[PDB]
Design a protein around this nucleic acid. Structure first.
Lengths: 199, 64, 116, 65, 143
RNA sequence: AAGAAGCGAACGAGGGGAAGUGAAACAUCUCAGUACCCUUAGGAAAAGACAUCAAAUGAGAUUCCCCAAGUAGCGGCGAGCGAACGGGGAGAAGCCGAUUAAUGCUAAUGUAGAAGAACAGCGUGGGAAAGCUGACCGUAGUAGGUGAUAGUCCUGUAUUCGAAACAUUAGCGUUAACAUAUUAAGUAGGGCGGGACACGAGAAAUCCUGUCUGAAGAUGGGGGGACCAUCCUCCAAGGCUAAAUACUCCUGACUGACCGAUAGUGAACCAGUACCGUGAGGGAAAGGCGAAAAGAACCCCUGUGAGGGGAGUGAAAUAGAACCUGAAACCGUGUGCGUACAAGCAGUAGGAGCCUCAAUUUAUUGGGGUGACUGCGUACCUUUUGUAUAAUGGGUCAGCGACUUAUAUUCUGUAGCAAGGUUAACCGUUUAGGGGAGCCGUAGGGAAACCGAGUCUUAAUAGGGCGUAG
C-alpha cells in the first residue's frame, strides 16, 4: 500500500493491484502460456504419401519367401515415411483476461514482498550514452534491472539496449515472463498508477 | 470447420427433457384392428427411454 | 525433438551381458540368449531360496539320526525324547554338536533315553 | 524483450506527433515526424512491423501534415 | 514473482498421458487395452453410433413424431433474474436485445417468474406470466 | 506490313469426367464433380451494382473471415449430405474509355561498395579466447572464425553513407492501337428429357438447355419456395469496373522447444548419377587425418610390388591417409582353473580343490578367476481349453520400427470469476489493450399454437406423464 521511492517520497499503490495474495498455480499457468505462445511451431516431416516414389509393390504377395511389402516408403523401411509425421502447429494458448490480470497482480505483489521492486520518481538519461546509465545504476545499487515507466525515450533505449541485463519497456507493453525473469525492477509512480487502472 | 454429425432421424425421434428422453410408443401404425382396445389406449401416449438406451441416445444426439 | 536410442540401449544391454558373465556360448555373448538365461537364473535363485532350507533341514536330520544311532537310538525317538525333556535345541545346533562334539551329543542322547 | 523495447520506443514518438497534430503547429509536427521516420524504416526490415502498415502510416502522417 | 525456475502448476492440475504399447510395466503393453483380436482391436475400428450388431436400432424401431415450428425459433423466454443487465427502466424487445438477454434476431419475448425483481420496470411489448406480473407489480413495475 | 506458334511451378476460369471405398451385402445414394484428360489467362482470376434480399424501425454491388449452425432442411428419411435469413468484421465504388503499348520528364527503389570504438600483465598450457589481477568502448555485449570459451585478434555489429550505366515503381505530359451500348425477341414463359440449386420429383418454388414452341413489351413484366388475391421490391434479353481473397518455379531479409549422414529433399559426396527396363518408368550406396601437410627426407626386409620396422613431424601417428571417437556380433594370441567312465534348455542352491591380490605377526580371514561332487531344473514369444511341444516367429549383432495431429463432444482434476462465465473473426508500434456478434447456464410442459413452476392428455378442476452452480 504505502511504499517508498529511492529518494524517500511516499507512494500510495492500491492493494488489489499491488497487494493481492500470491497464487502460484495461476502465475504458473500464465507464465507457461506466454512461453508456449513464444513458440513458432514451424516444422514438418514427410508421410509415405509425400515421400518420393514408393508407388509400386516391391515384390509379389506370395512365393518369394520374404515378409510382405506394399511400398518401399512404408515407415518400417529405411528411407520410408514417418508414421505420424509432424506438421506445423499453433502452440498459442488463450489466457482468460481476468486470469492474466490476476497473474500480473500477483507477480507485482510478490515482487514488492521480496523487495525486487524499486519505485523511482523519474528516470531520464540526458544523452544516448551507456556509461551514464551505468553511473545511475551504480548509485541505485541495481546492476541488473528491468525499467518500466510512462514513456520510452530514444536516448534511454539506446543506453539500455547494449547493457547485458538492462531492458526498458513501456507500462502498457509489459510481460510476466520479463517481470519474473529480470532480477530487479525499476518502475515509476505514474506507471504504477496506470498499472492500477489497467488491473 | 469440422463438427460432429447428429443423426437426422435420431433428432426427430428423440426430444430433450430435463432429466429424461421422451419417445412415442410402437405398434400403432396399422393392422391395429385385431389389437384390443385396452392395448390401443395403453399404447397411446408418450413413454420414457430406458436407462441403458439413454447412453446411446446421448451419443447419437449430443447437441440436443 | 528426436531421441536416439544408442547410448541407453548400449547401457541396457551391457547390464544384462554383465549379469550373464560366466555362461556358456551365446548365453554370455549375445543379448537374445543372455537375457533369457539371466531371467531363468533369477527364477532358479528364487526357487532354491525356498529349497535350501529344506535341504539343510534334511542334512541336519540325517546327521542327528547318525549320531543317535551311534549312541543307540533312532531319530524319531531321540526327537521325541528331546520334546519330552523340554529341550529346545534346534536341529542345526544338534547336527553341529553331533558332528564336532561326540560327548555332548552322547549326553543329550542320555537325557533323551532317560526321558524315554 | 529487446524487440518489445524497440517497439516501445516508437510509440512515444508517435504520441508526441499526435500531440503536435493537436497543437496544429507545422514545425513541431514536422520535427517529430522526421525524427520518427528512420526508426520506423529500420524496424520494417526486422519484420516486427508490416512494411505495408509502415507505408500506410507514412501516407496518413503525410496527409495529416 | 518467484523465479522462472520455481513455478509449479499445483497438485491435480496436471496428469500424465497414457502411452500404449510401451512394455509390461506400464500396464498397457502389447495391446493398449484393446483386448485380443476382434473388430474392436483393429486400427480403423470404431463404435458405430446407432448400430446394434444388425438388429434394427432403437431410433428405427420407434416412429418419428412432431414437426419443427419456425415461430419457436424467434421467441425468447426472459427470466426475472436476468433484468439486472438492462440499462434504464423500460423493458422492451429492443432493450432486451441491447442488454444481450435475447438474441438480436428474436422477434418476441416472454418474461417468466424465475428470480426476483430488484427495481421497477415498464414492460411494453412483451408477454408476462401470472407470477411474473404479480412479482413485477410487487416490486413496483406496471404493465 | 503486324502478330501467333514452343517451353515453364502452384493458384484462376471453362469443356469432359471415373472407380477403390462407406452403407458392415448392394443397385438409389456416397466417394464426388474428387483423381485424371483437354482448352486457356493474369498477377491474380472469377464475380460485381440489383428484373437482389427482406417483411424488421426495412437493407442497398461483388469477394473473403467469425457466428447463425451441424440449426432449417434433403435422405433405400438408411449411410450420409447440409443451408439460408441475419449479426460482427476485412475492404469499399461505381461507371459507359476504370483498355493496351511505347516514348519524354520529376521523385523513389534495386543492381557493385566506404568508414566504422575499445586489452594489457602473470601462471598453466602444443596452442589462451579459459584462470588470477587490473583496464578500456558501448547508438557496437549472447554473430562467424582465429591452435581451448574473445565486446576490445580478424571478418563483423550500432551508426552514417556513395551510382557512370541499366531495371523497376509511382506522378505528370504526349503519341498510336482498340473500344465507345442507349435500354434490348426467337428473348421471358410453356410441353418433353436431363442438369444445378443443402433439395434424390417431391406439394417443388428458383437457374441452365437438347427438342418443339413462344409473349407482354411500362395501362407492361420478373421475384417474394406449389398455386390464387393483396401488398412490397426491381426493370432481364448491351458492356465495363480497384480493394479486401487463392498460390509459390523464384528474389532479399529474418526465424525455428525442426533433422543432423539408416535422420533431413531420392540427392550434404560429380544424383535423377551408377544400376535395372524395349519403353513409359523405377532408382540407390557413399560425409569427418591434423590447428597448420608440417602428408613421413633418409635407412632396412621385400619383387623398384604390397606391407611393415626404424628415423623424422606433430600436443597426440593403435591421429599415417580405408586416417576424429571406435561399441556389438564375429575371429585370433597369452595367462589362471576345469575337462578324455561320463548322458539331456547348460542354469541355480550348496561345495572340495587350485590360482591370484590384500591384510594378519603369517595358510587364518576378505576381494577376484575356475568349478571336482550333490540336490532341483523340458528356452522365449504368439495363439490357445490346453504347449518343452514334433504348432508359429527369430542365424547373431548394431541402427531404424508401430496408439499420433486437427477439430467437435462428454466426464474428471485443477485455476480464475460466479447467477453469471466467456469472447470468435478482426483492430492492435500484435502474447497487452479493444472487439458483447455469438455460445453455455439460469425453466419446464406440449407435435404445435400456447402457457409457465407449472404444463400435456381429458368433458374433468378427477386420474396419470414430464418437471418443480455454472
Amino acid at each position: 500500500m504505502d511504499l517508498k521511492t529511492v529518494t524517500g517520497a511516499a507512494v500510495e499503490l492500491s492493494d488489489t493491484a499491488f497487494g493481492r495474495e500470491f497464487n502460484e498455480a495461476l502465475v504458473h499457468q500464465v507464465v507457461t502460456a506466454y512461453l508456449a505462445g513464444g513458440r513458432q511451431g514451424t516444422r514438418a516431416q514427410k508421410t509415405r504419401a509425400e515421400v518420393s516414389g514408393g508407388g509400386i509393390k516391391p515384390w509379389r504377395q506370395k512365393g518369394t519367401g520374404r515378409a510382405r511389402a506394399g511400398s518401399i516408403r512404408s515407415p518400417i523401411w529405411r528411407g520410408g515415411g514417418r508414421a505420424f509425421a509432424a506438421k506445423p502447429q499453433d502452440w498459442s494458448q488463450k489466457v482468460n483476461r481476468k486470469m492474466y490480470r490476476g497473474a500480473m497482480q500477483c507477480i507485482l505483489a510478490e515482487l514488492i514482498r521480496q523487495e525486487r521492486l524499486i519505485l523511482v520518481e523519474e528516470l531520464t538519461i540526458s544523452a544516448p550514452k551507456t556509461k551514464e546509465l551505468i553511473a545511475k545504476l551504480s548509485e541505485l545499487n541495481a546492476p541488473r534491472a528491468l525499467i518500466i515507466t510512462k514513456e520510452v525515450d530514444e536516448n534511454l533505449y539506446l543506453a539500455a539496449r547494449n547493457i547485458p541485463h538492462v531492458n526498458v519497456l513501456d507500462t502498457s507493453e509489459v510481460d510476466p515472463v520479463s517481470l519474473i525473469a529480470f532480477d530487479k525492477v525499476i518502475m515509476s509512480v505514474e506507471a504504477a498508477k496506470q498499472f492500477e487502472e489497467a488491473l | 470447420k469440422v463438427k460432429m454429425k447428429t443423426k437426422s432421424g435420431a433428432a426427430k425421434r428423440f426430444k430433450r427433457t430435463a432429466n429424461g428422453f421422451k419417445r412415442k410408443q410402437a405398434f400403432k401404425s396399422h393392422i391395429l384392428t385385431k389389437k384390443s382396445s385396452k392395448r390401443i389406449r395403453q399404447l397411446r401416449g408418450l413413454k420414457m427411454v430406458d436407462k441403458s438406451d439413454e447412453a446411446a441416445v446421448r451419443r447419437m444426439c449430443p447437441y440436443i | 525433438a528426436r531421441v536416439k536410442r544408442g547410448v541407453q540401449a548400449n547401457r541396457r544391454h551391457k547390464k544384462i551381458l554383465k549379469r550373464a558373465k560366466g555362461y556358456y556360448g551365446a548365453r554370455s555373448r549375445v543379448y537374445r540368449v543372455a537375457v533369457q538365461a539371466v531371467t531363468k537364473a533369477g527364477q532358479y535363485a528364487y526357487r532354491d531360496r525356498r529349497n535350501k532350507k529344506r535341504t539343510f533341514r534334511r542334512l541336519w536330520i540325517a546327521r542327528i539320526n547318525a549320531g543317535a544311532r551311534l549312541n543307540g537310538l533312532s531319530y524319531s525317538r531321540f526327537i521325541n525324547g528331546m520334546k519330552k525333556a523340554n529341550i529346545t535345541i534346534d536341529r542345526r545346533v544338534l547336527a553341529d554338536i553331533a558332528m564336532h562334539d561326540a560327548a555332548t551329543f552322547g549326553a543329550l542322547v542320555e537325557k533323551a533315553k532317560a526321558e524315554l | 524483450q529487446n524487440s518489445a523495447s524497440q517497439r516501445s520506443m516508437v510509440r512515444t514518438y508517435l504520441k508526441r506527433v499526435d500531440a503536435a497534430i493537436a497543437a496544429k503547429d507545422y514545425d513541431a509536427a514536422t520535427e517529430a515526424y522526421k525524427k520518427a521516420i528512420p526508426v520506423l524504416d529500420r524496424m520494417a526490415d526486422k519484420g516486427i512491423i508490416h512494411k505495408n502498415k509502415a507505408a500506410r502510416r507514412k501516407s496518413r502522417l503525410n496527409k495529416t501534415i | 514473482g518467484l523465479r522462472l525456475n520455481e513455478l509449479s502448476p499445483g497438485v491435480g492440475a496436471k496428469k500424465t498421458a497414457q502411452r500404449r504399447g510401451r512394455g509390461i510395466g506400464s500396464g498397457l503393453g502389447k495391446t493398449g487395452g484393446r483386448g485380443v483380436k476382434g473388430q474392436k482391436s483393429r486400427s480403423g475400428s470404431s463404435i458405430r453410433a446407432g448400430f446394434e450388431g444388425g438388429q434394427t436400432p432403437l431410433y428405427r424401431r420407434l416412429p418419428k413424431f412432431g414437426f419443427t415450428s419456425k415461430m419457436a425459433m424467434t421467441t425468447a423466454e426472459v427470466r426475472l433474474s436476468e433484468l439486472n443487465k438492462v440499462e434504464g427502466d423500460v423493458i422492451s424487445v429492443a432493450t432486451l436485445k441491447t442488454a444481450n438477454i435475447i438474441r438480436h434476431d428474436m422477434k418476441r419475448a416472454r418474461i417468466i417468474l424465475s428470480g426476483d425483481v430488484t427495481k421497477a420496470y415498464t414492460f411494453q411489448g412483451v408477454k408476462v406470466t401470472k407470477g411474473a406480473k404479480q412479482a413485477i407489480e410487487a416490486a413496483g413495475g406496471s404493465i
